[PDB]
Amino acid sequence: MGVVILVLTGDERIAEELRKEVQKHDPNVKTVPTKDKEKVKEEIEKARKQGRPIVVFVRGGDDERAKDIAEYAQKEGLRVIVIIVSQDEEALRKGYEDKKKKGYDVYTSRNEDEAKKKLKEALEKSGSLEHHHHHH
């Protein structure tokens, strides 16, 4: 029992504002930025014990980190989600297929809006519920 949501953002500030969005959807979900690269794998061990997802923010180019975290999480039999935030459809597609063939459920996003929907959708699929995904 455990889920690992890897949000690969073209801008690290998108990664940071989406962190706040996860915490508002559920504070018990642990979020780790692009900064604390070392501490991610420790937080994955703990996230299973929390019965909550861990949302790992990775940068567009810092993908070497993303795939190794993904494979480490998937090694524990965890539901690995990968959300790529890029306005460029090639940056979306190449990462999409690369992580998808490794057994990970990968979402593509244009910007913060699409990133936010897929983020909270991955939070709903892990069990964390707050903001009901309703038609405004």
User: Which two three-digit tokens encode residue 81?
Assistant: 């989600």
Determined by NMR
Q: How far apart are CA 11 and CA 58, in angstroms?
A: 10
> What kind of architecture, by CATH, is found in domain 1-136?
3-Layer(aba) Sandwich (3.40)
Q: How far apart are CA 12 and CA 33, in angstroms?
A: 8
Cα angle at 40 between 35 and 41, to 5 degrees? Answer: 150
Q: What is the DSSP secondary-structure string of 109-124?
A: ESSHHHHHHHHHHHHH
Q: How far apart are CA 110 and CA 133, in angstroms?
A: 19
For the chain, the domains span: 1-136
Secondary element (H or E) of residue 73: helix 63-75
Q: How far apart are CA 44 and CA 70, in angstroms?
A: 10
Q: What is the DSSP secondary-structure string of 12-65?
A: HHHHHHHHHHHHHH-TTSEEE-SS-TTTHHHHHHHHHHHTSEEEEEEETT-HHH
Phi/psi at 31 (5° precision): -115, 130
User: Which two three-digit tokens encode residue 71?
Assistant: 């494979």
